[PDB]
Design a protein around this nucleic acid. Sequence first.
RNA 1: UCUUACUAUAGUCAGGACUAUAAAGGUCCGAACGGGUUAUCGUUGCAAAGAUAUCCGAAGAACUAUGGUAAGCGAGUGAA
RNA 2: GACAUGAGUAACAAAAAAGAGUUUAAGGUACCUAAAAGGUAUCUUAGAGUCUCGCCUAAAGCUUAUGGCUACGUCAAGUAACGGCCUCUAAGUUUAUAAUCUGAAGAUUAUGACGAUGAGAAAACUUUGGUACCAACAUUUAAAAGUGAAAAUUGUGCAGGAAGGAUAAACCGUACCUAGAAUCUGAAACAAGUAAGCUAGUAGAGAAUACGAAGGCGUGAAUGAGAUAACAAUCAUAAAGGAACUCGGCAAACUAACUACCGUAACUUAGGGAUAAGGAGAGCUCAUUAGUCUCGAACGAGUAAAAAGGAAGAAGCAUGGAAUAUUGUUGUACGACUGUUUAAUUAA
RNA 3: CUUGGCCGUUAAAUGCGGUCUUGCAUGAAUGAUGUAACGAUACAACAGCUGUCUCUAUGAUUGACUCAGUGAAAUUGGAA
RNA 4: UAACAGUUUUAUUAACCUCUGGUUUACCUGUUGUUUAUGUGCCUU
Lengths: 46, 110, 192, 235, 119, 45, 57
Amino acid sequence: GPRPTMSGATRLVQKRRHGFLSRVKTKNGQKTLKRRLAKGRLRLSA
Amino acid sequence: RGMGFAGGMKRHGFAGQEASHGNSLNHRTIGSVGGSQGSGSRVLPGKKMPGRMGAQQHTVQNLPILMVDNELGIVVVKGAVAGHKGAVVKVQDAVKKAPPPEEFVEATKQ
Amino acid sequence: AGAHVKYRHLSRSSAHRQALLRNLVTSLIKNETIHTTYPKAKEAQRLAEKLITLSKRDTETARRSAQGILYTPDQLLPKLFGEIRERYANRPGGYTRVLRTEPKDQYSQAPSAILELVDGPKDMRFAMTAATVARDREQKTESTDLTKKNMDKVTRFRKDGMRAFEDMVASLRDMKFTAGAINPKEWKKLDR
Amino acid sequence: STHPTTAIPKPTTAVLKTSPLAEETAVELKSPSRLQLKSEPGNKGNPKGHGDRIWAFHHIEQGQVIYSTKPVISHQHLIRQQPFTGKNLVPRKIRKDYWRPLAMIELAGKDQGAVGRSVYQKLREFKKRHELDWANEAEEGRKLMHKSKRERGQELNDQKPNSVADMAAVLAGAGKGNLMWQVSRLVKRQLRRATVYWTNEQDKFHAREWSDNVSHEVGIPGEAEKKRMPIRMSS
Amino acid sequence: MIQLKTMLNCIDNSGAALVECAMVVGQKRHASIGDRIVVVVQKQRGTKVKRGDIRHAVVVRTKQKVQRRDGSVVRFDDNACVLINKAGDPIGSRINGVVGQELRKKKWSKILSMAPMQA
Amino acid sequence: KRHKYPTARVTRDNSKQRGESALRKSGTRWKLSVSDEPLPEPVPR
Amino acid sequence: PKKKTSHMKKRHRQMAGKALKDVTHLNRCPACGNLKRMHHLCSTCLGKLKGFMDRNG
RNA sequence: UCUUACUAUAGUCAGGACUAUAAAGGUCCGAACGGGUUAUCGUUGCAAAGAUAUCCGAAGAACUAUGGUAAGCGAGUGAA
RNA sequence: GACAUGAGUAACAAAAAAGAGUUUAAGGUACCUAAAAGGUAUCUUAGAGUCUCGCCUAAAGCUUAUGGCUACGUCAAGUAACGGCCUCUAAGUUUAUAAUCUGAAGAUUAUGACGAUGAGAAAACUUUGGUACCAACAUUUAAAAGUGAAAAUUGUGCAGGAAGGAUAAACCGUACCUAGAAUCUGAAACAAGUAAGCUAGUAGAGAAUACGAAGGCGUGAAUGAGAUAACAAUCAUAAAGGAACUCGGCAAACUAACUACCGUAACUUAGGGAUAAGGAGAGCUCAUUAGUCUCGAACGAGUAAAAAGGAAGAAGCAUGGAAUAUUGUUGUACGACUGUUUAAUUAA
RNA sequence: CUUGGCCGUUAAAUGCGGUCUUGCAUGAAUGAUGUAACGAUACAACAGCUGUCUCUAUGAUUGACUCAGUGAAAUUGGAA
RNA sequence: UAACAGUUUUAUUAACCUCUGGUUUACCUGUUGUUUAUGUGCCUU
Ligand SMILES: [K+]
Ligand SMILES: [K+]
Ligand SMILES: [K+]
Ligand SMILES: [K+]
Ligand SMILES: [K+]
Ligand SMILES: [K+]
Ligand SMILES: [K+]
Ligand SMILES: [K+]
Ligand SMILES: [Mg+2]
Ligand SMILES: [Mg+2]
Ligand SMILES: [Mg+2]
Ligand SMILES: [Mg+2]
Ligand SMILES: [Mg+2]
Ligand SMILES: [Mg+2]
Ligand SMILES: [Mg+2]
Ligand SMILES: [Mg+2]
Ligand SMILES: [Mg+2]
Ligand SMILES: [Mg+2]
Ligand SMILES: [Mg+2]
Ligand SMILES: [Mg+2]
Ligand SMILES: [Mg+2]
Ligand SMILES: [Mg+2]
Ligand SMILES: [Mg+2]
Ligand SMILES: [Mg+2]
Ligand SMILES: [Mg+2]
Ligand SMILES: [Mg+2]
Ligand SMILES: [Mg+2]
Ligand SMILES: [Mg+2]
Ligand SMILES: [Mg+2]
Ligand SMILES: [Mg+2]
Ligand SMILES: [Mg+2]
Ligand SMILES: [Mg+2]
Ligand SMILES: [Mg+2]
Ligand SMILES: [Mg+2]
Ligand SMILES: [Mg+2]
Ligand SMILES: [Mg+2]
Ligand SMILES: [Mg+2]
Ligand SMILES: [Mg+2]
Ligand SMILES: [Mg+2]
Ligand SMILES: [Mg+2]
Ligand SMILES: [Mg+2]
Ligand SMILES: [Mg+2]
Ligand SMILES: [Mg+2]
Ligand SMILES: [Mg+2]
Ligand SMILES: [Mg+2]
Ligand SMILES: [Mg+2]
Ligand SMILES: [Mg+2]
Ligand SMILES: [Zn+2]
């Protein structure tokens, strides 16, 4: 079954992993933004 | 003496089950209530089960008369008698014994 | 399967059930009356009548036992061995009265009652009977045998007695307390 | 075990009537103390200058008051002078942007430091008896007993008005063993001269009446240097 | 009330000092004063009985209270017995200690003949 | 203080603020020099 | 449950002998003549008399 | 952001006892803390891994915190 | 998708716990009174408080973090009584630069930049390498005494214990919640889980155990009032016997902690075994006192001084008086040992 | 094969311990063999201890039952 | 004639508390730690 994996989770690790700068500055991150931007998402990251 | 709803141990002398050797929630229960398909696929009539106990008539036979006091109004009999103090009981000559002598039966009527 | 209960347990523990009775008897003596549930009013009635018996004793063992029942002895002991002792000197028992009333709490609809001290400043049967006699005199009716029987009960052992009861009736007429009271001769004609 | 008094009329030792409950004034409840009948009590066993001035700081938003002998307060004052008045009502520290000087008491005697240590003692005991044993504000005035435990704790934190009425009392001889009396015992007694410096001219009107031995001055030394200008009623 | 695995004190000069009950002879209920049992000698004293021998014994006194006809109840501080043979005669020739008085009605005259004091 | 060594007999209540609260108006623990006078009443804000 | 309980059998259990019993132990109040419960105090007179003994005495 | 290993910077381990040491021990008894031995309860549970008692370690191969590194053709990490 | 059945059933039981008064607002009833109004009493909804009682207490308290579908009048040049921003750098990161390698993508080394969980002048006014170092452990030190930090001093062991820079007041954070009573993670108002400091006192070696000052709490009817059957759970006691139970002493009971007490076997890698085993003592009162301390005047007196003290004494069924610490011994198999392991059925 | 033979332990031993010239199918770093110490490993015995049992009884709290309020679930071809 | 003394066991079913025991959670007594309230409380002139 699922586990409580978000216990003790901080919001500084959310910007370093799934933030916006982590995606525009990486080759594989531009795809995610372009993919999410083509679908029409508002929340491109974090 | 009425005893309300009695279980299997008090009402029918069921032995019960174990206390500590792994028993789960079944220490004073009745256990099995019959066989399976070959025994009728039903609980058989006359099965001993929990229910109300007491408050039923009971006879004690062959109790001698130790004392007879007219002033006090008491008739002391050997042994125990069914019921609680202040309960009405029926006293009569024993049925499994010879009736009282003929002379006595006439003296009392006289 | 065992023996019958000696008294009411009131779904409480031993220590919790003794404090409940010491608190009901403490509020009764302090306030002269309490409105509670009926089972509690009947369990505290036996302890309230056994505490007033200790207030009519001359030994110290009674003064130490009465100190162990109340929760504020320093404030309530003078009243116990004072006013309360003087009031019940001539009465042989029956110092308290339990009267059933409508549910105090409408959520649970639990039967309630009023445990009070007879011949006290807040006797509810003394004021209810004075209100019945105040309505009979203001309506030119005749009191029933049950009212005359209650008039003597609430005035036999009272200090002032009848004089304190006539003043209660007089105050209930100058105040117009029986205004709007249905005459007893018209009860047979009322469906609701 | 504690014993709370009742809001009943009582006599005062001060020359003025501190409260409407005060029955009599300038009543001797005990023979003059050792230093009371002394023209010049001195700083016998205290540092030079100690007791000549007494500062009073207050929270400009909540009204919490603190008394200090030195020109500045520390963390010891907040712990030893602020009783618990509820959750989120006792600050964890002293915030420089909230605490300002309320007033400053200066005695005429430039070296009678023992007279100030007595005024500071009665002010701290009165403040404790204002947060505790507030029977005169339970059903009258602020009516603290008619308020919630939250609102009641916020009104107890506001000791600024009470503190000003405590100064007019202590400086008028209130308290037993007050060293601001001076008994000649040749037996005539009088009050010692004092001066009160106020950061706000309107803050001295919390006391219904002041004694005749106190002089009121606006502004506290060292305040102007901090670019803090005093408040003047006349303007 | 002597039952299986009950330790008794043998008070005769047969050779045993502490025997363990192994069977109640002639009844299902636990044995009281004057009832037969089968014991196993566990200790001796210094044709005596050797440790481990199986013999018949008679309960002479018990620690469980024994009510009597006249309402007089007796209680001893320990459970004791005397060894006997399958015929019913005591093996020992002398008994040291007080024995229960319930042996008279249970046809144990021989055991009482050499009993110094009865209680 | 007669005996001053650190093991001297302790006869004081080390819980200074025992049964003392402002929200409940418990009152002062001990009798002070200002406890016999009426609390000065100020002019409200 | 092996089978769904029918409308007939579920109506038997719900209303057969489970009708709300009408309270018939009522009598008027002697002080005001309102409908009170037998052996119980009048709630309208209790509160009023309880409040009348608190003002004067 | 779970978890495994490593890594950098930090923190924690009442008290008592033995031992050659004032401090040199994968030492001893035992809280915190960390484990999860046995048992009962629970099993549409308070809980998709919990409660109670009991038990084990508790200056070390210890435990914890905030970051970082290594994982998905080949297998990352693994006192396995 | 709607609506049935089970069923008006289960459930609202963390072994803390409640009882009796008072009161505010709005509204619903009945009466008074019919000039509307208002008054008295009662009920409903949302609150508040008083007295008594109990529970938590090295918490279920206070102050704050992580965090937040709780809410927006939360206020700082700096120190006392503050963090961030900013400066320096670690582990590392780099679509920065150069060189190099490379099917493309990319990778590598150096430099630069960035990167806290670390380091950053002064202030109750202020702006070289033991000539060492600030890992662990121990010791010593702000002079009336004791205690707890900080920083430093000295020493010990081997497992041999960072980097770099120095050296007239902007901007951002500030409210509430800390999980036993309305807020974090567990799908939720979940008996679980989560960081730091403080966390009365008595009593102890102690943060153990017991009581509990303040404080909070005894949940949003997500409940309340009765009754006290069987049975279930969690417990308490028990005649005689004492493992006869059972796959098996599973569970439970016995034992227990303490003293500078006595004594302690086989065997042994000579360290152990060992706190072996097995015994003794304990609270209250008191004679007695070398010194220390106090009082009076060397001496005298004193435990309304700490201790010491004895083959003294009193009372009771009982003085390890309540709570806390779960038996002893013996012969084997396996693996030397301390440890590790299938998160959530196998801990060996 | 088998509860191998013998001895000790038990009133009674397919067990445990010792022993045999005892290996269907032991064996030497897939190490062989015997001790000290250690073990929440596994088996066996002794003493104590006990409701484990002979053989259960009584008592306490929370549920279970009744009244008031709120109000599920698995399941169900249809059912006299 | 009086008086004195003696006149089964086991098993099972049910009832029953006189006796012998067990139980006793609002009974009496003794007692430890600690808290709360009330009263009282040292020497000397
Ligand atoms: K997983
Ligand atoms: K069970
Ligand atoms: K059938
Ligand atoms: K179950
Ligand atoms: K700043
Ligand atoms: K490439
Ligand atoms: K027993
Ligand atoms: K009996
Ligand atoms: Mg985490
Ligand atoms: Mg009956
Ligand atoms: Mg049984
Ligand atoms: Mg058939
Ligand atoms: Mg209930
Ligand atoms: Mg208790
Ligand atoms: Mg705050
Ligand atoms: Mg992580
Ligand atoms: Mg260790
Ligand atoms: Mg340990
Ligand atoms: Mg693990
Ligand atoms: Mg496991
Ligand atoms: Mg160990
Ligand atoms: Mg059903
Ligand atoms: Mg039901
Ligand atoms: Mg239910
Ligand atoms: Mg209204
Ligand atoms: Mg940088
Ligand atoms: Mg940092
Ligand atoms: Mg929770
Ligand atoms: Mg918790
Ligand atoms: Mg939640
Ligand atoms: Mg603890
Ligand atoms: Mg809280
Ligand atoms: Mg409540
Ligand atoms: Mg016994
Ligand atoms: Mg057996
Ligand atoms: Mg068997
Ligand atoms: Mg066990
Ligand atoms: Mg002794
Ligand atoms: Mg004696
Ligand atoms: Mg091992
Ligand atoms: Mg191990
Ligand atoms: Mg597993
Ligand atoms: Mg090999
Ligand atoms: Mg090997
Ligand atoms: Mg219902
Ligand atoms: Mg009897
Ligand atoms: Mg009693
Ligand atoms: Zn009426």
